[PDB]
Design a protein around this ligand. Sequence first.
Ligand code: DTP
Ligand code: DTP
Ligand code: DTP
Ligand code: UDP
Ligand code: MG
Ligand code: MG
Lengths: 734, 35
Amino acid sequence: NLLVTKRDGSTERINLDKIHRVLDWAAEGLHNVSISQVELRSHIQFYDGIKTSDIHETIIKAAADLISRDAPDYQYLAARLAIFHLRKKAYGQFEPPALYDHVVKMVEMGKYDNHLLEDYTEEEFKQMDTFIDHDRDMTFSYAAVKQLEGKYLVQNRVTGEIYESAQFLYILVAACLFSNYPRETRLQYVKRFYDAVSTFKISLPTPIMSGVRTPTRQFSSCVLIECGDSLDSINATSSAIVKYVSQRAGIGINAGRIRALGSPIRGGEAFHTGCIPFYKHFQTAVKSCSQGGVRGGAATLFYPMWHLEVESLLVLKNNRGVEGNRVRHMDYGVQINKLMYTRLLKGEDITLFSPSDVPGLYDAFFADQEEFERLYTKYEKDDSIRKQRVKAVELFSLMMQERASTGRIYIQNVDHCNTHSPFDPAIAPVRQSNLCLEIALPTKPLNDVNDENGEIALCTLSAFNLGAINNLDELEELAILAVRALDALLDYQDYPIPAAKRGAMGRRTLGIGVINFAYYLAKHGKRYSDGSANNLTHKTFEAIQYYLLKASNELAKEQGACPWFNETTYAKGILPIDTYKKDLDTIANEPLHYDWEALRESIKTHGLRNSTLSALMPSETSSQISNATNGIEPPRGYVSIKASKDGILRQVVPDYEHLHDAYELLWEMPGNDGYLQLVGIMQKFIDQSISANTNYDPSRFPSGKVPMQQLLKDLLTAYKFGVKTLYYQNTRDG
Amino acid sequence: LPFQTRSNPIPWINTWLVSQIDSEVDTDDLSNFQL
Ligand SMILES: Nc1ncnc2c1ncn2[C@H]1C[C@H](O)[C@@H](COP(=O)(O)OP(=O)(O)OP(=O)(O)O)O1
Ligand SMILES: Nc1ncnc2c1ncn2[C@H]1C[C@H](O)[C@@H](COP(=O)(O)OP(=O)(O)OP(=O)(O)O)O1
Ligand SMILES: Nc1ncnc2c1ncn2[C@H]1C[C@H](O)[C@@H](COP(=O)(O)OP(=O)(O)OP(=O)(O)O)O1
Ligand SMILES: O=c1ccn([C@@H]2O[C@H](COP(=O)(O)OP(=O)(O)O)[C@@H](O)[C@H]2O)c(=O)[nH]1
Ligand SMILES: [Mg+2]
Ligand SMILES: [Mg+2]
């Protein structure tokens, strides 16, 4: 006799048959699910006047938490329930409106960008509505749908009001990016790129997913800012951070140029307060805002290992100190080169300098490795220069110790980033990396927020779904669609900082990675640890780079190479297959299958539309859309628990029922050698870097403690095979 | 078997029917390396 409150405000008598019908629909065709389980696990507390929208959200939560190894199909039952709820939230019904009627209302409300109506006619919009297959919303998993409604679908960040559905996001991201294409082939690409992303061939990053169709145009995931040793640069760096974190960006800061504590200022007119007070200023710049209301602001700061304050900077996240010399809420990347590693192997010392007391030592540290060793040993002997010697064994032990406890002390081998990079170190060296240590692009410090001379490195991302391809030659067509869509994005979006637009338009750097690599190895019956995937990884990532280079090479023929292409090593006719670290020849014997010499000639002749193309990012959130295993990392378990704005999410590995034996889970690995070898093989072809993780299980070691010997041996093993950067250090606890 | 194969439609009924860092370092072992 009690009443439920419908979505339109009216009421009617409570009828459990309505709930049975919904669940029977959502469980249709699924194996080993239970309508009764979902209803009983809901523990739904009825009361007179209970909202019908709250009732539905309860059974979604209940079905979502039933995702298990024994019942993996709940990932689809909860997804179908969640899509149904999301259709009502934005449209009030199940069937979405016409593409034109929606864009009209949305551009009218200021939620979409104005250009959608100007660049496409109503006859063109109706033609793309025929491309849409709204039944592809029934191929998502629950983790994918929660990331859609939580982060990607256009919504109000104060109301929580959901405005669109999934297939509209895809078709409009395709529409906006190719909106500036010629009309004889425009809709040809728009359909093709929509099909590629809606069938999970290509993965799009968070800012493209949540941005491309909205008024505010910023879709670059990574922003790299270099800071000079002046207040004007520090002020400029701070302003740029604030602007970019507010527009969906993760910052990489290079504050290594700042002179050390105690150094003279204006010849002794002032005493330098130190780096840490400025690091604190960089932190408040990052934490002042949110990344477009999608996630929180984050940044990683870089400094050379030989900096004078290096022992104080390595412990900045360490909670065992006073707040004055702690900057906990930023990650850090220690920059190391061959000479630093040599001092450890020989048990010698490492001399620390302020960059202001060693002329040319900083720039040589990146661009000229020989010039660095000359100046370093020279200044080490000079008794007039302020220095400080530390045992290399002690400095390395402190670094890895702080890396182990926080998990966020990263490593960047600066020599590898320049000796094996797409850039000429003498013209445009790589001096830093980004938040997740997968981006390596040139930067020049700023003297003002609008300083035209400085360069801020931007990189736009996307990923190839390795589990969705059946032949490596599908990448040729996929690299064309991906590179074209991203290069068009560079002209389509806005730039809050002039120095950043300069780098983005000059070099046009892209960062295309891969997802579902662990599921890819399972399909080929290979594993991380044993090294059985070495030749398969070599064959795979050769095709990824070849078809990416080829695509940008043809796009260079069509619209001209990037303005600053002459600064790349591709301009000199140098390919990744030349500059890679030769130690890879002892861990993989797979031969090159594609015609690189013809590609070398064509790049010498026509150039590249993009200075960089490939970079392997973690894809923490974006990979979940295709229910793929994130990036190149092995899944934590057959059912992984991943984070969400609402709560926790259960994600089943792809094709669990047929491949649970083929997977090698994260903690089933004996050590790091097999993984790091695969990363080293990948790095042979990747233009930029890889967000390489190191993992350690304390229970696998005597006395339950992880030895410093193993942490350092793995770190040297990574350098031996040309690994550019090191990301997270995962330490088990269970 | 008179009926089609089927998974348990009420799986909930089964609950009622059955009951630091080892900091030591060895440089000589690390010296046996070539970067
Ligand atoms: N009379 C009812 N009593 C109890 N629950 C109901 C009733 N009708 C529907 N439900 C449940 C079933 C669904 O899982 C959930 C959402 O139903 P839904 O059909 O979206 O709401 P609604 O019927 O008020 O909106 P709409 O008018 O769009 O159908 O509510
Ligand atoms: N082809 C289909 N596509 C989508 N849903 C379907 C389909 N066939 C059956 N259903 C299910 C989904 C809904 O749970 C149910 C009908 O939804 P709905 O219009 O909300 O009816 P209802 O039971 O809520 O009655 P009312 O909305 O009139 O109160 O049937
Ligand atoms: N008054 C101050 N107190 C603390 N630190 C300062 C002060 N002024 C500058 N710094 C820091 C910030 C820079 O990293 C560094 C030099 O700043 P900068 O603006 O380049 O000085 P300057 O150009 O006036 O003289 P110089 O560069 O010769 O020391 O010292
Ligand atoms: O919490 C985050 C995670 C990532 N990123 C940015 O996204 C890039 C790649 O991260 P990933 O692909 O894992 O994120 P996704 O786009 O998949 O959410 C990083 O370099 C960061 O610049 C960020 O700003 N905040
Ligand atoms: Mg209804
Ligand atoms: Mg100065």
